[PDB]
Design an enzyme around this catalytic site. Sequence first.
Site, PDB file in Angstrom:
ATOM      1  N   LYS A  94      -0.694   6.351   8.051  1.00 50.90           N
ATOM      2  CA  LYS A  94      -2.369   5.996   8.587  1.00 50.90           C
ATOM      3  C   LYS A  94      -2.787   6.923   8.657  1.00 50.90           C
ATOM      4  O   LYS A  94      -4.220   6.885   7.678  1.00 50.90           O
ATOM      5  CB  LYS A  94      -2.142   4.080   8.602  1.00 50.90           C
ATOM      6  CG  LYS A  94      -1.512   3.482   8.655  1.00 50.90           C
ATOM      7  CD  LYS A  94      -1.297   1.728   8.916  1.00 50.90           C
ATOM      8  CE  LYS A  94      -0.570   0.798   8.700  1.00 50.90           C
ATOM      9  NZ  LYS A  94      -0.580   0.125   9.643  1.00 50.90           N
ATOM     10  N   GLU A 122       2.956  -0.287   1.460  1.00 55.38           N
ATOM     11  CA  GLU A 122       3.518  -1.636   2.574  1.00 55.38           C
ATOM     12  C   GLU A 122       3.880  -2.597   1.986  1.00 55.38           C
ATOM     13  O   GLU A 122       3.508  -2.922   1.181  1.00 55.38           O
ATOM     14  CB  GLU A 122       1.958  -1.663   3.337  1.00 55.38           C
ATOM     15  CG  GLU A 122       1.309  -0.066   4.155  1.00 55.38           C
ATOM     16  CD  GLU A 122       2.707   0.468   5.517  1.00 55.38           C
ATOM     17  OE1 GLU A 122       1.501   1.345   6.056  1.00 55.38           O
ATOM     18  OE2 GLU A 122       2.991  -0.513   5.182  1.00 55.38           O
ATOM     19  N   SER A 146       6.010   0.890  13.629  1.00 58.55           N
ATOM     20  CA  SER A 146       7.410   1.302  13.766  1.00 58.55           C
ATOM     21  C   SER A 146       8.041   0.366  12.542  1.00 58.55           C
ATOM     22  O   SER A 146       6.888  -0.743  11.966  1.00 58.55           O
ATOM     23  CB  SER A 146       7.240  -0.221  14.441  1.00 58.55           C
ATOM     24  OG  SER A 146       6.320  -1.424  14.156  1.00 58.55           O
ATOM     25  N   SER A 155       3.533   3.897  10.026  1.00 55.37           N
ATOM     26  CA  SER A 155       2.487   3.438  10.678  1.00 55.37           C
ATOM     27  C   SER A 155       2.043   5.221  10.677  1.00 55.37           C
ATOM     28  O   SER A 155       0.393   4.803  10.615  1.00 55.37           O
ATOM     29  CB  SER A 155       1.961   2.456  11.128  1.00 55.37           C
ATOM     30  OG  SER A 155       2.289   0.861  10.868  1.00 55.37           O
TER      31      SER A 155
HETATM   32  C1  LIG Z   1       2.766   0.751  10.795  1.00 55.28           C
HETATM   33  O1  LIG Z   1       3.608   1.449  11.419  1.00 55.28           O
HETATM   34  C2  LIG Z   1       3.784  -1.102  10.629  1.00 55.28           C
HETATM   35  C3  LIG Z   1       4.653  -0.995  10.710  1.00 55.28           C
HETATM   36  N1  LIG Z   1       5.445  -2.245  10.411  1.00 55.28           N
HETATM   37  C4  LIG Z   1       6.534  -2.489  10.033  1.00 55.28           C
HETATM   38  C5  LIG Z   1       6.586  -3.350  11.902  1.00 55.28           C
HETATM   39  O2  LIG Z   1       7.850  -2.892  12.063  1.00 55.28           O
HETATM   40  O3  LIG Z   1       5.671  -3.476  12.853  1.00 55.28           O
HETATM   41  C6  LIG Z   1       6.174  -4.487   9.319  1.00 55.28           C
HETATM   42  C7  LIG Z   1       7.971  -4.712   9.888  1.00 55.28           C
HETATM   43  C8  LIG Z   1       5.729  -5.193  10.172  1.00 55.28           C
HETATM   44  S1  LIG Z   1       6.318  -4.472   8.081  1.00 55.28           S
HETATM   45  O4  LIG Z   1       6.807  -5.505   7.074  1.00 55.28           O
HETATM   46  O5  LIG Z   1       7.471  -2.804   7.280  1.00 55.28           O
END
Ligand SMILES: *C(=O)/C=C/N[C@@H](C(=O)O)C(C)(C)S(=O)O
Lengths: 260, 260
Positions: free
Chosen positions: A46, A139, A210, A43
């Site tokens: 973004k 995403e 993440s 992320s």
């Molecule tokens: C931004 O970095 C968003 C991350 N998204 C993922 C995370 O590990 O927080 C999920 C798993 C929410 S997304 O389905 O990849």
Amino acid sequence: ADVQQKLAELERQSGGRLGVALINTADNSQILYRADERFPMCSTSKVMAAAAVLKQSETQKQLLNQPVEIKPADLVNYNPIAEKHVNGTMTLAELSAAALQYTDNTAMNKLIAQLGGPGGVTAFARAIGDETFRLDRTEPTLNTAIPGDPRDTTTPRAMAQTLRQLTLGHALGETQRAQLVTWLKGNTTGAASIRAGLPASWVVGDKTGSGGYGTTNDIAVIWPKDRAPLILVTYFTQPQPKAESRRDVLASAAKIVTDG
Amino acid sequence: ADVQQKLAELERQSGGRLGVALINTADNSQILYRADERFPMCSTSKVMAAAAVLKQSETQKQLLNQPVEIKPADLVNYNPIAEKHVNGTMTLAELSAAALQYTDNTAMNKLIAQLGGPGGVTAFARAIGDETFRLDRTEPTLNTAIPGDPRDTTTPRAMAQTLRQLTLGHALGETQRAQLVTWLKGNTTGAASIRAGLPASWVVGDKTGSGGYGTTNDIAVIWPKDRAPLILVTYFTQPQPKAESRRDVLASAAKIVTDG
Ligand SMILES: *C(=O)/C=C/N[C@@H](C(=O)O)C(C)(C)S(=O)O
Ligand SMILES: *C(=O)/C=C/N[C@@H](C(=O)O)C(C)(C)S(=O)O
């Protein structure tokens, strides 16, 4: 007292792969650790997308007020802001704020679509002199973070340089630069990451990320007390597919590179 | 049983005192741990002050737009927002956001002055049924957090009940309750505290606090995924004046009380 020793120890003890680039804008000096390796942005990408839409808005002057439809099918894990507006609209400014300040993946997808797909975000990066960044997916799959996969990656050094140009330099027009900084400073997700390693009196804007493989990222612009700002990128990823997040590693790295 | 034993185990390894009150609004059940002992609120008191100003704005139409002068003598540790407006003004909405969403102690002092001093914030608490809360000093000294001192204290139980009434109940008018919840959800300082103990899908609005004696606090409204909200207060304080912050202890308490 040795910054490379400290970073190598953190990395080893963490079991993962740590990437760090600091720019001190007082003198253009850097602190680098695995700064030219590629890491999954997750992320943290973004920022590039929101800045791309800001750039668009320098010539489509009402673009940030444009309503965008939020349909139930647009919801992607996590969507804390967009879920509240499903079956309605959000403006591009609201979407940009959602994407930047919250975990909002649906808002990111609307930015990507505004730019004509992931390649549009990469095209902006190329326009502002970042030849390293690549966005290739939407995403949530841009967060898979598979080891060895170059999709949706950059290097700490490139992202530090880009974030400097966006927030402190002239990649964006002045109003758009100030908007970006206002949004980053209002981030909700960052207090366990870079900021947790810094003195409490310092002002921080940041974007975290993440994903898969325990990937745990943060990129920040930092104003120490009456000093010139710093840009700090801390990327982290792990060997196990389902590893836990490690925001504390990013905090630990931020303390190591700013101590003194 | 399980929970109570786990919180005691946590407390016994923490090097301090821990106070917990969880209200599950699905059934009005409570999970309490030292919930009738007094703890220093530190910046968690900013919730009561911002809410008292919201209450005032139900009858003084436009109050939140009112500009308030910021002078150099007003600056107190920390002042990340107010410093940019010295020899200028901030509106009561900006001061409320500043106080809630950031560290800003000057912004709190302006809320307190708008309420007629610390006693006006305590009067508001009494007006909404909180007979426990007691604000007796401005910033920064309301954060001294000396063990045994009743100044600027509440209990977990009282604070949880009040936060319920403010955010979910009818202590405020509907527009003002919604404003309070929007502000809390936009907090920048919370990710290492209660939120770090919860699943990443859950949505949190919260106010942290820090002060002397390693005092480390958070009060939160929590929306688990498609479930009725929770109120959670986690207070923590330590016996030595210069003790370090223990946000981790708050995250751990949050995970213990929500694992069931
Ligand atoms: C931004 O970095 C968003 C991350 N998204 C993922 C995370 O590990 O927080 C999920 C798993 C929410 S997304 O389905 O990849
Ligand atoms: C809100 O909780 C603010 C607390 N402020 C203090 C802190 O520990 O962060 C200080 C030390 C900044 S204030 O001078 O008491």
